[PDB]
Amino acid sequence: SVDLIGINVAGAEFTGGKLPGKHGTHYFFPPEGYFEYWSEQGIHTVRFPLKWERLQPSLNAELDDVYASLVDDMLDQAKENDIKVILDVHNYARYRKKVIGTEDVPVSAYQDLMERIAKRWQGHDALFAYDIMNAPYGSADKLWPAAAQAGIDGVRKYDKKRPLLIEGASWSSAARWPRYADELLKLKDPADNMVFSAHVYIDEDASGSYKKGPGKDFEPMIGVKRVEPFVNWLKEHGKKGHIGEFGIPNDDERWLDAMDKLLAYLNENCIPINYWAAGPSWGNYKLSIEPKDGEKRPQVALLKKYAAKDNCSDFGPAKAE
Numbered sequence: 055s056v057d058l059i060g061i062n063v064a065g066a067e068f069t070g071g072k073l074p075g076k077h078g079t080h081y082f083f084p085p086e087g088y089f090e091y092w093s094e095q096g097i098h099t100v101r102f103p104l105k106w107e108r109l110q111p112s113l114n115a116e117l118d119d120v121y122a123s124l125v126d127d128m129l130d131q132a133k134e135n136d137i138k139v140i141l142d143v144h145n146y147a148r149y150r151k152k153v154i155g156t157e158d159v160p161v162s163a164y165q166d167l168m169e170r171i172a173k174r175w176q177g178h179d180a181l182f183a184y185d186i187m188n189a190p191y192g193s194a195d196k197l198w199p200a201a202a203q204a205g206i207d208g209v210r211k212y213d214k215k216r217p218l219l220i221e222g223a224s225w226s227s228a229a230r231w232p233r234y235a236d237e238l239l240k241l242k243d244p245a246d247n248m249v250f251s252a253h254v255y256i257d258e259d260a261s262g263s264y265k266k267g268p269g270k271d272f273e274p275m276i277g278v279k280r281v282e283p284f285v286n287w288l289k290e291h292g293k294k295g296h297i298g299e300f301g302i303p304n305d306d307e308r309w310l311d312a313m314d315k316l317l318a319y320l321n322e323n324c325i326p327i328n329y330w331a332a333g334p335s336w337g338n339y340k341l342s343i344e345p346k347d348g349e350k351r352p353q354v355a356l357l358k359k360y361a362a363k364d365n366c367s368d369f370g371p372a373k374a375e
């Protein structure tokens with residue numbers, strides 16, 4: 055089933071310059087007991103970033119045994135705790151810093167990754183969906199629609215059922231979505247089960263850096279205003295949508311006000327959200343909602359408030375009848 059309220063659980067993609075890196079030093083999967091907390095809080099959908107270069111250290115080669123087995127174990131813990139998991143290839147449409155579709159990283163190698171991901175995990179009950187690439191940007195933008203088709207073809211070799219979450223150019227900006235997304239209308243899914251997934255941060259430059267506070271002329275509808283181009287594009291083209299990332303600092307009511315207005319608009323349109331982010335090794339990261347001694351997490355109350363208002367049976371927005 056489709057939960058409107060979900061969270062990112064980040065950590066497996068950390069310290070991306072250390073490849074392969076060492077689990078528990080450079081990157082972090084959920085420990086035992088991790089999902090039990092969020093399950094108890096009423097959050098039952100998790101988006102889970104993975105680093106492509108760790109899953110597949112050589113293009114077209116078998117998946118890495120150590121890192122892929124950590125994914126196996128996370129999915130097991132998810133299933134044990136009634137957690138639905140969106141696997142996220144958290145790679146900005148690049149492999150070892152080279153754009154998918156260049157000579158260095160042919161689209162067939164990206165198709166290969168997605169085939170092996172689907173082949174390994176389509177049988178797993180905790181797997182909910184594939185977010186096939188996180189936040190394409192920059193020099194990857196123009197090649198990304200062709201890359202996405204290869205990723206879709208890859209998953210569909212082995213998983214004919216589950217939703218594919220398709221992000222957009224420009225860090226999958228919700229605010230700029232229709233500037234680029236017409237290129238995604240060419241994508242073909244044989245299973246006809248794609249969901250487009252945009253991201254939204256509400257600091258001025260939408261980077262999620264939150265270097266400054268809200269500012270005196272802060273607009274509390276800024277979150278709604280920044281997802282409206284995305285949701286309206288979905289309505290215009292009869293598509294289904296999703297917000298894969300949104301996060302705010304914990305230290306100004308204006309941020310929380312904008313978050314509440316955002317969740318209201320997403321609820322009205324049956325658009326799920328994955329809050330960015332929870333995770334086992336965030337420290338004092340300003341957007342973290344992971345419990346931390348002495349750190350307040352007002353955002354989690356808003357998530358629970360809207361988890362209880364979730365009356366949707368499928369990804370929105372609704373089509374006209």
Ligand SMILES: OC[C@H]1O[C@@H](O[C@H]2[C@H](O)[C@@H](O)[C@H](O[C@H]3[C@H](O)[C@@H](O)[C@H](O)O[C@@H]3CO)O[C@@H]2CO)[C@H](O)[C@@H](O)[C@@H]1O
Pocket residue numbers: 188189224225227253255259260261262299
């Ligand atoms: O850094 C790790 C996280 O990055 C998130 O992406 C952000 C990029 O890091 C940031 O460079 C980019 O900033 C853009 C901004 O989006 C755009 O509006 C402005 O015009 O230009 C900026 C670059 O100068 O923002 C994105 C967020 O929108 C990933 O989303 C996250 O997955 C990853 O963990």
